[PDB]
Amino acid sequence: TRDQNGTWEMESNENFEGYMKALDIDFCTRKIAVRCTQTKVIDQDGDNFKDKTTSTHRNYDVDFTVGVEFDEYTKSLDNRHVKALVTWEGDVLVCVQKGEKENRGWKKWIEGDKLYLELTCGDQVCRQVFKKK
Amino acid sequence: TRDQNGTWEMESNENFEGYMKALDIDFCTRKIAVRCTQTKVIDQDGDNFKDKTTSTHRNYDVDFTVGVEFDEYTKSLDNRHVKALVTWEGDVLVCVQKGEKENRGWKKWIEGDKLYLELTCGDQVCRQVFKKK
C-alpha cells in the first residue's frame, strides 16, 4: 500500500559507511553516525508528506552500589579507566573518579521534579538539568 | 529526597564543551556531542543503582508534495543543496536529488509491517529497514 503513516524505528542499516564516504563525509563524523539508530515519524495526507527523523545512540549502562568502589570505563566520552566511588552527602550523590585527570567527579541530586547533575574535571564545571518525563 | 527513580530528559546543558575539552575529546566529536539531548533512565533500589543513558539528535524536518520539485539542504549529512523530485512508481516513492553528486536519490516503500529505504549516491547503495513501533 501507499500509506507510510507512523512511527518507524530502524532495525537494519547496511553499507551506511560506503554511502557516507561517497558523499565525502569526514572520517570522524562517519565513525559516530554508523553506531546510531534512527526513528522516523511519517505524517502523510494524500501526496503531502511531513517526515521527522531523530538519531539515537545508547551509551553503556553503569551499575554501582553506594559505598563500593568500582571500575568504570568512560567509553561514552574519553574512554579512560577510572576508579569511581559514590557516597551520599545528605541527599546529594557524590562520585570521585580517581584516574589520570585530576579533580574528576560528579554530583547528582533531586530538587523538585528536576534532577541536577554537576560534572567536574580539573577547573571545568558542566551543569545539566533533567525534568521527569 | 534520595530516590532518583525514573526517566529523565535533559532540559539544559551548560559548558559541556569546556568539560569535554578538559578531557581531550577531539574537536569533531565535541561538535556533534554538544547538539545532542540525553535521556536518563534511573532504576534504584536502596543503594544499588542502574543507569541507562541515551543521546538523541533531532534532524530537521523534510516536507514535500509528490510531484512538486523542492529545494532541500541535506544538513543532517553533507550539507549540500539538491533539487529533489518525488514521484510514485506503483507504491514505491522515488526521489531524484539533482545536485553536484551524480545518481543521488532514494526509494521508500512498505512491505508488511516494514518500511524499506534505499539510498543511492554514485555507485554506492545503502539499505535501511524500519519496523512499525
What are the domain boundaries of chain B? 1-133
Q: Which of A25, A124, A125 would you mutate first to test chain B, the one with the most B CBs within 10 A?
A: A124
B20 inside 8 A of chain A by CB:
yes
Task: Please answer whether residues B49 and B43 qualify as being in contact, where contact means their C-beta atoms are separated by less than 8 angstroms.
Answer: yes
Task: Please answer whether residues A132 and B7 qualify as being in contact, where contact means their C-beta atoms are separated by less than 8 angstroms.
Answer: yes
Bridge partners for B111 per DSSP:
B114
User: Hunting for cell 521534579 — which residue is that?
Assistant: A113
Q: Do A130 and B21 touch (CB under 8 A)?
A: no
A99 vs chain B: nearest CA distance in angstroms? 12
List helix spans (H) across B9-56. Answer: 16-22, 27-33
Pairwise CA distance, residues A106 & A89, whole Å: 12
Please choose, from the candidates A119, A72, A43, the residue with its C-alpha nearest in 3D space to the C-alpha of residue B49.
Answer: A72
Q: Is the dihedral of CA A84, A86, A89, A94 positive or negative?
A: positive
Residue B113, class by beta-carbon neighbours within 10 Å (0-12 exposed, 13-18 middle, 19+ buried)?
Answer: exposed
* B115 vs A contacts (CB less than 8 Å): 4, 8, 40, 42
Pairwise CA distance, residues B125 & B104, whole Å: 10
Q: Do A23 and B67 touch (CB under 8 A)?
A: no
Half-sphere exposure of A107 (CA within 13 A, CB side): 13
Please choose, from the candidates A10, A16, A14, A3, the residue with its C-alpha nearest in 3D space to the C-alpha of residue A39.
Answer: A10
Nearest 10 degrees: Cα torsion B66, B70, B76, B81: 150
Give the length of chain A: 133
Pairwise CA distance, residues A4 & A116, whole Å: 40
Pairwise CA distance, residues B80 & B58, whole Å: 18
Please choose, from the candidates B59, B37, B110, B126, the residue with its C-alpha nearest in 3D space to the C-alpha of residue A1.
Answer: B110
Q: Is the dihedral of CA A32, A37, A43, A47 positive or negative?
A: positive
Pairwise CA distance, residues B19 & A33, whole Å: 22
List helix spans (H) across chain B. Answer: 16-22, 27-33
Q: Do B119 and A76 touch (CB under 8 A)?
A: no
List helix spans (H) across B23-101. Answer: 27-33
* A16 sits in which H/E element: helix A16-22
Q: Is the dihedral of CA A47, A52, A57, A58 positive or negative?
A: negative
Look at residue A30 and give its three-state secondary structure.
helix
Pairwise CA distance, residues A45 & A36, whole Å: 29
Pick the CATH number of A1-133 from 3.40.50.300, 1.10.3720.10, 2.40.128.20, 3.40.50.2300: 2.40.128.20
Pairwise CA distance, residues A26 & A34, whole Å: 12
Give the resolution in Å.
Answer: 2.4
Look at residue A29 and give its three-state secondary structure.
helix
Structure obtained using: X-ray
Q: Do A128 and B50 touch (CB under 8 A)?
A: no
Given 3-state DSSP classes, what are the helix, strand and coil percentages for chain A, each rounded to the nearest 5? 10, 60, 30
Pairwise CA distance, residues B123 & B110, whole Å: 24
Instruction: Calculate ∠ Cα B53-A61-B18, nearest 5°.
Output: 55
Task: Please answer whether residues A109 and A115 qualify as being in contact, where contact means their C-beta atoms are separated by less than 8 angstroms.
Answer: yes
In this structure, the strands spanning A124-132 and A48-58 are unpaired
A19 vs chain B: nearest CA distance in angstroms? 5
Q: Do B11 and A114 touch (CB under 8 A)?
A: yes
Q: Do B121 and A77 touch (CB under 8 A)?
A: no
Pairwise CA distance, residues B7 & A36, whole Å: 21
